[PDB]
């Protein structure tokens with residue numbers, strides 16, 4: 001999750017298998033023109 | 043006026059009672075107003 005230049009960007013990746021080994025890039029999923037201020041999440 | 047009509051107590055509404063028999067400059071006009079915003083913004087709405 002990133003928030004830059006008034007855009008919210010979400011990248012995602014899924015895999016069927018403590019964190020595993022190996023390399024696997026994440027592909028872009030969604031961009032949103034929301035333009036708010038973000039400081040905390042849950 | 044204790045919530046009742048009377049002298050100096052007028053209901054602030056008035057009816058139109060539109061009829062097809064009025065003059066040309068008397069029938070109701072259907073009006074719309076479109077307002078834009080020319081500023082720096084994400085610019086969600088844009089033309090074809």
Ligand SMILES: *[C@@H]1O[C@H](CO)[C@@H](O)[C@H](O)[C@H]1NC(C)=O
Nearest residue numbers: 005006035036037038039040
């Ligand atoms: C977001 O909030 C922080 C802390 O209140 C403030 O420093 C920052 O300027 C704000 N940014 C925007 C774009 O409102």
